[PDB]
């Protein structure tokens, strides 16, 4: 097995792969059509000890081997000029070979483990968890725990271990331990990202009704985000609907309906867009399961309406039409206003397929912001600035390195422009307020918070060489008002502003330390 953990990985004589063995171990797990022939052709089982089906012993030997192996192997990361915010970043494996082999083994076992009926796994369902829980308590940042325990609890529900748990002492202790572990990892759900977030989603959404019945409201936002991600990745929605059916059949509609209001709506976009696991059978699944419910019961998918102005976004970014443009032609130059295009082009630049709609949208938005900058030499786009630059900082931290490479030089150039003396009064104030009140406050977008930190850190430059300090005093904007704003945000009870201020100074370290 520690040989087989050295296989090559796959992405989501010739060198082998893990799959080249998985069926074999299923053939080993299902060695019932093959040892039967051997015991039939043999007559040795007269003074021989055993004549039973040894596939149970095969599973036990595999489990004890993998247990001692994973106890033997150890995994850890290391760090590394510039500080990083999230503990999930600035992580480099101390011995990446161990990480790679751990990968190899986990996607090797992920298919072999669940197919066999788990009466063989029953004696392990407690023990195999405990030290693994240890392995999770010391290292709570591993996807293998979540997904392997997903298939583990699937096998357990194939055996029904959690049935009739005490409100058996062994069952009571194991059930309570998984309950507390599940609730704490549900609390910690918020800080994980893809290939780690998805795994713990599969975990905290594969648990049996004996645990959902205890708490629902904590998982309500978890279900919302899991189903909004199931649009992007169908298996999430598939296992989500399976879990929904499990507890809904198993738990009475007496403590979940006060949450049905915000439980239901996150499914709409599934059926709104189109006419192993695909979105189409996803929809057909939700279709009949929704119809299985009563009328008033399934009325609560329309409850998301308080943000009707947010989905509207038809409030004019510029109330008057300030984006006049006469298209150059021979005998006709129609004057065209570009304020109406803003919402649609925002969701293009944010959400577009083919990966080439986005880049062309970026090109047009560069051109049109450039044209409006040229136009500004004649209107108040105060409201336009407030409503439009937040999506610009939203697209600042895009996963596309091409997008950041396009955008950050423009960010620093507009920094140069804004902190100039001619742009230091009454028109940068809107830009600075919208840029500081968004992008660092968010519960998400750690990359965006870091990018805001770096851009303000470099904004310190040309805030002193383009504005003389006496002018900083004359202008109402100065270091002092920035200090009061920082203090006010830092004292805010929401911990997002606290972490934002601490990280902001952590960034300005090596820059503010030169201040005298």
């Amino acid at each position: 097995l520690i040989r087989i953990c050295s296989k090559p990985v796959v992405l989501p004589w010739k060198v082998p792969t893990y799959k080249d063995y998985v069926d074999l171990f299923r053939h080993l797990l299902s060695s019932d059509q093959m040892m039967d022939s051997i015991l039939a052709d043999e007559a040795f089982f007269s003074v021989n000890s055993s004549s039973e089906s040894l596939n149970h012993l095969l599973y036990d030997e595999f489990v004890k081997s993998v247990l001692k192996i994973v106890e033997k192997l150890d995994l850890t990361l290391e760090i590394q000029m510039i500080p990083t915010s999230d503990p999930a970043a600035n992580l480099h494996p101390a011995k990446p070979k161990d990480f790679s082999a751990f990968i190899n083994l986990v996607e090797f076992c992920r298919e072999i483990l669940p197919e066999k009926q788990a009466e063989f796994f029953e004696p392990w369902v407690y023990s195999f968890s405990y030290e693994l829980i240890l392995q999770s308590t010391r290292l709570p940042l591993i996807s293998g725990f979540y997904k392997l325990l997903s298939i583990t609890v699937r096998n357990a529900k194939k055996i029904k271990y959690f049935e009739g748990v005490s409100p058996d002492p062994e069952k009571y202790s194991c059930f309570a331990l998984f309950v507390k572990f599940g609730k704490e990892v549900a609390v910690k759900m918020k800080q994980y990202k893809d290939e780690l977030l998805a795994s713990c989603l599969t975990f905290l959404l594969s648990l049996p009704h004996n645990i959902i019945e205890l708490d629902v409201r904590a998982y309500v936002p978890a279900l919302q985000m899991a189903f909004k991600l199931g649009l992007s990745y169908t298996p999430l929605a598939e296992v989500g609907l399976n879990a929904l059916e499990e507890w809904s059949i198993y738990i009475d509609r007496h403590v979940m309906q006060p949450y049905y209001k915000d439980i239901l709506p996150c499914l709409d976009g599934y059926l709104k867009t189109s006419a192993a696991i695909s979105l189409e059978e996803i929809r057909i699944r939700v279709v009949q399961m929704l119809g299985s419910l009563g009328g008033q019961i399934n009325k609560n998918l329309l409850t998301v309406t308080s943000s009707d102005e947010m989905m509207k976004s038809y409030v004019a970014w510029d109330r008057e039409k300030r984006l006049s443009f006469a298209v150059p032609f021979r005998e006709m130059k129609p004057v065209i206003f570009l304020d109406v295009f803003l919402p649609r082009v925002t969701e293009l630049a944010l959400t577009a397929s083919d990966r080439q709609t986005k880049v062309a949208a970026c090109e047009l938005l560069h051109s049109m912001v450039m044209f409006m900058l040229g136009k500004a030499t004649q209107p108040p786009m105060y409201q336009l600035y407030k409503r439009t630059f937040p999506v610009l900082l939203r697209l600042a931290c895009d996963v596309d390195q091409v997008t950041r490479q396009l955008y950050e030089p423009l960010v620093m150039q507009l920094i140069h422009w804004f902190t100039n003396n001619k742009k230091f009064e009454s028109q940068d104030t809107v830009a600075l307020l919208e840029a500081i009140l968004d992008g660092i406050v968010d519960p998400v977008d750690s990359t965006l918070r870091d990018f805001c930190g770096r851009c303000i850190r470099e904004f310190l430059k040309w805030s002193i060489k383009q504005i003389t300090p006496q002018q900083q005093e004359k202008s109402p904007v100065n270091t002092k008002s920035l200090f009061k704003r920082l203090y006010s945000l830092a004292l805010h009870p929401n911990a997002f502003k606290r972490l934002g201020a601490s990280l902001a100074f952590n960034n300005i370290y090596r820059e503010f330390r030169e201040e005298e």
């Binding site: 150059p328 880049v359 090109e363 560069h366 051109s367 900058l373 091409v402």
Partner: peptide
């Protein structure tokens, strides 16, 4: 597949509003 692009705008300290109409026309 592979990327497609049409303009790698010039680099500086500020923008150059000297750019022609065609640049805003094509996207």
């Amino acid at each position: 597949a592979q990327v497609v692009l049409y303009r790698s705008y010039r680099h500086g300290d500020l923008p150059d509003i000297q750019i022609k109409h065609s640049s805003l026309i094509t996207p």
